[PDB]
Amino acid sequence: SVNLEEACMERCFPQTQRRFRYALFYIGFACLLWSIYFGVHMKSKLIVMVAPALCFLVVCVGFFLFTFTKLYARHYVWTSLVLTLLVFALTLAAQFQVLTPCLSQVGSFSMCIEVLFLLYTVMHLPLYLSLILGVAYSVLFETFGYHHWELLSRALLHLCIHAIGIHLFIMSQVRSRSTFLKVGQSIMHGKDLEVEKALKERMIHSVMPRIIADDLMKQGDEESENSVKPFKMQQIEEVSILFADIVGFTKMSANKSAHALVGLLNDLFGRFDRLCEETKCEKISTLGDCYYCVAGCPEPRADHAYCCIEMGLGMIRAIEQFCQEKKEMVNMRVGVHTGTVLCGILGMRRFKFDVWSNDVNLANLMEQLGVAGKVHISEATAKYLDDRYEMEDGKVTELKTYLIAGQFASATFSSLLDVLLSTTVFLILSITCFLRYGAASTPPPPAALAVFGAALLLEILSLVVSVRMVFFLEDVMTCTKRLLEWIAGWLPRHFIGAILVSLPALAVYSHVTSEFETNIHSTMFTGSAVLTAVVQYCNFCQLSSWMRSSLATVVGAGPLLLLLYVSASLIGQEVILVFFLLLLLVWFLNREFEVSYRLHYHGDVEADLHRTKIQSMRDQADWLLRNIIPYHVAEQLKVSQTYSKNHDSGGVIFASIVNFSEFYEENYEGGKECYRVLNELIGDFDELLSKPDYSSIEKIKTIGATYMAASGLNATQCRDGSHPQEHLQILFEFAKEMMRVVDDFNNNMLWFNFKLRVGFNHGPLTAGVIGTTKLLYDIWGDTVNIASRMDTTGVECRIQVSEESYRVLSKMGYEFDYRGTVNVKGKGQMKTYLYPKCTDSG
Amino acid sequence: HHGSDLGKKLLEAARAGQDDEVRILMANGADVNATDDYGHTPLHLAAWFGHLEIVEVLLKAGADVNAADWLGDTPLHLAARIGHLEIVEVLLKHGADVNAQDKFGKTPFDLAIDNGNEDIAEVLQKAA
Structure with missing residues (x-):
């Protein structure tokens, strides 16, 4: 140190x-x-x-x-x-x-x-x-x-004055240490809390665009930003819904280093962010072999379509400049489509900002009908093309579409300490006061022993008070403690202490009541002792200042201006001078020390303030992390630049609300509250996710109204105490349970039962992280788009399952009914089953 | 409330139509205007299930006439979207509102036209 x-x-x-x-x-x-x-x-x-x-x-x-x-x-x-x-x-x-x-x-x-x-x-x-x-x-x-007495009497006065010396010393020393140290911690918290503000702002804005997080970082409605330990949704018209999928992605992603594709992809997407910022367009999400931005959502732009389309064209140059750079020639289909869309947020776990409308799916389709390298725009887009480009009536080669290629010291420790002080020094003081007695063998004066006993009583009881407020031994009764100490607050402490440190002056006054001045040795002595005792009025510093010091003046000196009226003659004059100046000391010394204690109490208040404030920001921002990224993987960019990993078996399930699309009917302005209900169930799902029997499950995101789930990925520590193939089982169990959940939910939803279709695949995958200066998590591999197409072609209330996943779960024991072997894009026929057995009449 | 399960069981009673259990819970002083997590009232659970006798025993218990669910829809909106004219009549006699609307911006009258429930859409043409 x-x-x-x-x-x-x-x-x-x-x-x-x-x-x-x-x-x-x-x-x-x-x-x-x-x-x-x-x-x-x-x-x-x-x-x-x-x-x-x-x-x-x-x-x-x-x-x-x-x-x-x-x-x-x-x-x-x-x-x-x-x-x-x-x-x-x-x-x-x-x-x-x-x-x-x-x-x-x-x-x-x-x-x-x-x-x-x-x-x-x-x-x-x-x-x-x-x-x-x-x-x-x-x-x-x-x-x-x-x-053979008076000498050692004076020596004892020296001893006590050294006592109060050292105690006063170590007190002032640790006090002006502690305040220094606390101010050190306070400035540490100043910088650390600005830092955590910066980080939390980074994460927030990497999950919501500018305007919304700017809006909700002022917390004008304090009840909304409590989910961050809720939100509002808005519908906007005349938007530009751009898309992109890596054409032939599985092929150009046949065999990579599980990091190579990761990195190059990060590169492409950082490029595309660099593009949108110039086009001032809001990137939104990245579905695996895909990506997409939007435009005109926060600010519907007059030329939102123009920034969008020209941005896409710039992406064409970017992709070609990388294809002829890393030597992998895969451009991307592009679907552009306008119309209206209600945006907002849903969910509480892994929740992100998102957008929903028919137009959403429409632009996705026009992507699927888009040609690799050029864009299949719509007439809703062409309504203000202003014919400044390469317009071509691009139609399916097999509605109103076009192809465009471009163009220590606790404030209660001080109490016991300085009361120990007052009591022991008063003790040896009154020791002296007695020790004057070699002439009157047994000590005559009555007031002497009276006040001596009274002080002994008070001091010992209050000392015990303090030793049990410190060390908490609980001799007799405990509830009485919380009752009586309760009294000893800001003022009761005032007066108990006033008496408690006044008592040594009265101690020395007990012996003087006699006529003594006839002996002037006695007067010299008792003067010395009273000035000692008045100097004891410095110790109890956790009390007031003006009050304690004025008590010093009066009830130490006043009575010697009184014995000024025993008229031992002009020794009075020398004594009034010495006390005048000594009292000047004790005044200004004491007030300085109370300044010291005041400031220490303050500089502990303020350090506690910043302590709890940093704890607030830390829980907030770290939990925001766990909102975006899971913890196990949260290490690898905290510690390095990035992260990637391969898992060869992880179940993935979608779940959409198909009959939402009907009960979507927008007779309500905006349809917002219907999405509130969706969000209700999404919550009800997060509620599942927080269950520990739902540990190995990880929601990946929420697309449209869908629900991406995964498992078998976080817990890498293969312990002796499990069978590694369990994860799919608990997974599908969770699936069945949330299926029952939507039912339960529908018991409440007036005159509507919202039904869900669910798909499935398990097998290899790639975990990856994208954003830097932003952040995004995602998965790829066969399994992702495999199951994606599955639930894209699934039947509701009946859990579609991939053939080999069907097999592993059949050999787990679960009951399935065959559905059909339907063609799979890029794969051919694949045997599909449903889990629900005799759920319908057929 | 203070142990608002007598009102929860009240909600289940008004929903499934447990006739005598209604009388029992109202003897138990059950919370007449207790609501679910979704703002639904015993009228909501009633109209959904069409227990008009239980609607009337609840009116003996004395719930609200124009209470709406957390989804802003009153059981008038419900019954409009249901089709039980006889159940609609008792609330017009109880003084329901004719020109209001749910959180969805249309007067509950048009909700009868939602299912084309002209039976009650007629009844709503009478008052104003």
Whole structure:
């Protein structure tokens, strides 16, 4: 902790220099009032004192104007060492020249105590070192006060004053450590929280376009952005729905490094983003061997079709410039189609921004009817072609279409600590106060033992209060704890402490009630002790400042202005001066320390604030990650540039709402709430996904109203405790269950039963991740488009299944009824089965 | 509510038409205007199932006349899209609204024409 706790002092400097500057000033004021005392009232018979006084004054102010120098910024330690040794010598010398009978030993003791403080508080000196200097000074001064009780009484006063010394030290030291450290953590959180804001914004905008995330990053409706720990959908007309599929993709993806195709594809799509940004068009999604943007959705553009089509043409140049670059000649079919579309978001898991209309499927079809290299546009597109290009009445070679090729220290630890302090030092103080008794063998005065017992009672009970609010041993009863401590709040603590630290002054007052001044040794003594006790009024710092200090003034000194009325004569004058100045100290010292505690409490409030705020942002953004990408794979771009992997067996299932397309009827303006209902069921599906018996299942995305699912992919750790072929089984089980779910859902949907057709395939695949400065996940291989075509040609409420998947599940035990061996694009005939057995009458 | 299952079982009663169970739950002080997760009211579950006697025992229990589901459609919209004129009459006597609409923007009257349920579309031509 060395290099760090260097910068610590390097930061906490200017306060230290301020303390030094004030201590210097006070030393000035003290020596100077001594001088004027000695130069007017008494001691007009010598210069042995006052010239030393003024010399000390001037060397002090020399230090004072010094403190602004540059070859001091690293020497405040040694500067304090110099100054303190100087004042040590000054006090001891201005003392030794006594003990003939005209300068009281109490005055000497004021000097002793005060210099001992300003050694402790302000010097910022090492603990061990300030300690040894304190004790050396102490013993040497009490010896120079010697040139069988009274001596050790004064020695005990020295001991207690060193106690409060060290405690005050370590308190101020750990406090101005802790505040430094907390401010360090606070600035760490400042930067770290700006960072997590940046990352969370990245992920968000890589799942929704500009306007929508800008709109929902101000959270004007605070209830919507609670799903991020909901959303609104809008229908827009006159759009441009572009498409693309990698023609002959399976062929140009026959044998790759499971990374090669990944990378080159990332490249192409980054290209296409670079294109849309210039055409200001909103890319939307990438279906495997496909891709597509849209236009005119957030802002229906006057030439949205134009940006769209010319963007596509630019994609033609891009694809050809890569085909003749990496030497793989596969361009892409293109279908363009306009009309209206309701966009929005659906789902809560893996949910993304998306669009829905007839026009959607229409443009997809016109893609399928598009020629590799050119676009099969529609008349709804041609309505403002403005005939500036290569227009050709492109029709099926087998409706209104065209082909275009272009053109420590806890604020309750402090309590027990400083109450330990007050009690032990009051203890040894009253030890002294008794120890005066060698003349009256048994201690006569009644008020003495009365207040002694009373203080013992109070202190021990409150000390126990604190030790059980700390260490929680629970001797007797526990509910009583939460009840009575509850009282000890901001003010009750005020007054208990007021009494609790006032009591040592009354302790010393108990012994003085007697007539004593006839002996002036007793008065000298009790003066010394009362100034000790008044110095004890520094310790309890978790209390107020003005109040505790004014209590110091009054109930320490006032009664000595009272014994001013025992008229032991002008020792009164010297005492009122010493207390005037000592009280000046305790005032400004104390207020400074309360500043220190105030600031530490503050600088723990604020660090806790940023602590919980970073926790908010962290849960939010990390869960947003788990929204887009699964965690196991989430490692590989967190740690590297990308990720890819091959799995040779993973089940994929679609599920659409076919009879939605009918109950789609747009008699309701926008049909929005129908999609709300769809979303309802989509949620009801996420609800499944969060089930741990649904662990190995991963929704891939939600297309249109469809539902892409996969499995057998995340848990790579093949443990002895499973049969690896289980994943398809739990998968299809989940499938049947969600099938029952849509039924349950339909028990509620008024007079409509929304039915779903589901397809299937299992086998090889490629997991991959696309976006950078964005992000997108996806899968390829045979299995994806295989099952895609399956549920594209499936029968509802009857789970179509691929032949070999049928086989593996039959050998799992599940019941199937044959459906037919229907031709598969690029594959020929394939045996299909349905899982539902006798579900219908046929 | 405070244990709103007496109202949930009320919903299932109004739906499936458990006649005596209606009387039982209303004796149990069941929540007369308790609703499902989808805003449906006992009138919604009733019109769906055509238990007019149970509609009337619920009117003894005393639900709302113009309550709509979370899908904004009132059981008037339902019955329009259903075709039970006799069940429609009791709510016009209970004072249903004629010029309102669901969250779908058409007066429930046209919902009779949705199925071409001219039986009730006629009834809705009478009041205004």
